[PDB]
From a paper:
By varying the protein-expression conditions, we observed crystallization of YfeA in three crystal forms. In this report, the lattices with edges 42 × 52 × 113, 62 × 66 × 67 and 55 × 67 × 82 Å will be referred to as crystal forms 1, 2 and 3, respectively. The structure of crystal form 1 was solved by single anomalous dispersion (SAD), and the structures in the other crystal forms were determined by molecular replacement (MR). free of 17.88 and 19.03%, respectively, and used for MR and refinement of crystal form 2 and crystal form 3. The high-quality diffraction data enabled the resolution of holes in aromatic and proline residues. Although this observation suggests that the primary ligand at site 1 is zinc, further inspection was needed as nutrient-rich conditions contain unequal abundances of free metals in solution, and zinc is the most abundant transition metal in LB. The inter­atomic distances of site 1 ligands are 3.0 Å ≤ x–x1 ≤ 3.6 Å. Based on this analysis, the interatomic distances of site 1 ligands can integrate zinc, iron and manganese, further supporting the hypothesis that YfeA site 1 is polyspecific.
YfeA is a polyspecific cluster A-1 SBP that is important for Y. pestis infection and transition-metal homeostasis. Biochemical analysis indicates that the Yfe system transports manganese and iron, and complements their respective transporters MntH and FeoABC. At the arch of the c-clamp is a tetracoordinate canonical site composed of His76, His141, Glu207 and Asp282.
Residue numbers in the entry: 38 to 311
Write the structure that this text describes.
């Protein structure tokens, strides 16, 4: 066991999924830090160093990392793999990014199984000496992710279907909402230029009042102020922060992908009174 195979990912969700597949034969690090906004992140010379010292680079694609392709052009002789191949996208509904794939596909546990398979294939291709380990670790982790879906689905099924309105800041939950039958309301369709401008806030407020939706949420990498303004003006409580674009730090309450899905579902369910 000389030097461990080095994997660099764009963001933290992919870091943790890949690290479960890598086990003890590879070390996986994220370019973005926990809590950092990932869509419009501005890479630094230090990020170039980290990616250039890697043996493999993993990214989401599907219009997530607006910075990645320009950044990767500075990197020489390091293979990359997009981890979302084979996932059917949901289009973004409105705004200047309307009609392109919504990148947040990892919020569906079923889609996470495809992330796992794509990461496994990339590690086996670029580090074939450890293929048996990657295959073993991917099978075990896929078992955990597959089993995760049933209790989450049952928990959210307790909310009456007519009342299943998921009101968030970024429209980052479209894949989770599809899986579990929630209608989707948001202050902005995807992180970008305008987040909480008028017109956006007014539309969400109107839907909340028309349907008597009991709760609204924010997310861990963006401002909570728009959601709190919406809750102040309506009958909805502020349900707290959902985790989608980043894990917490490893000593925080959301250290892993499994913890992120569980925490987000638990926070939604509690917002609805379980
Ligand atoms: Zn996002």
């Amino acid at each position: 066991t000389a030097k461990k195979f080095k994997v660099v990912t764009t963001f933290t969700i992919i870091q943790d999924i890949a690290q479960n597949i890598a086990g003890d034969v590879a070390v996986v690090e994220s370019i973005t830090k926990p809590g950092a906004e990932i869509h419009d992140y501005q890479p630094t010379p230090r990020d170039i160093v980290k990616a250039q010292s890697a043996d493999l680079i993993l990214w989401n694609g599907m219009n997530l990392e607006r910075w990645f392709e320009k950044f990767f052009e500075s990197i020489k002789d390091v293979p990359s793999a997009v981890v979302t191949a084979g996932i059917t996208p949901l289009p973004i509904r409105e705004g200047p990014y309307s009609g392109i794939a919504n990148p947040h596909a990892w919020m569906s546990p079923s889609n996470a199984l495809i992330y796992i398979e794509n990461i496994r294939k990339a590690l086996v291709e670029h580090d074939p000496a450890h293929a048996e380990t990657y295959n073993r670790n991917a099978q075990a982790y896929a078992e955990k992710i597959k089993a995760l879906d049933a209790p989450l689905r049952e928990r959210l099924s307790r909310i009456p279907a007519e009342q299943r309105w998921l009101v968030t800041s970024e429209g980052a939950f479209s894949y989770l909402a599809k899986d579990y039958g929630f209608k989707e309301v948001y202050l902005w369709p995807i992180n970008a230029e305008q987040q909480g401008i008028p017109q956006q806030v007014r539309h969400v407020i109107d839907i909340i009042r028309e349907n008597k939706i009991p709760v609204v949420f924010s997310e861990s990498t963006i401002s909570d102020k728009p959601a709190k303004q919406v809750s102040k003006e309506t009958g909805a409580q502020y349900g707290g922060v959902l985790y989608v674009d980043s894990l917490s730090g490893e000593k925080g309450p959301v250290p892993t992908y499994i913890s992120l899905i569980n925490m987000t579902v638990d926070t939604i369910a509690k917002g609805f009174g379980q």
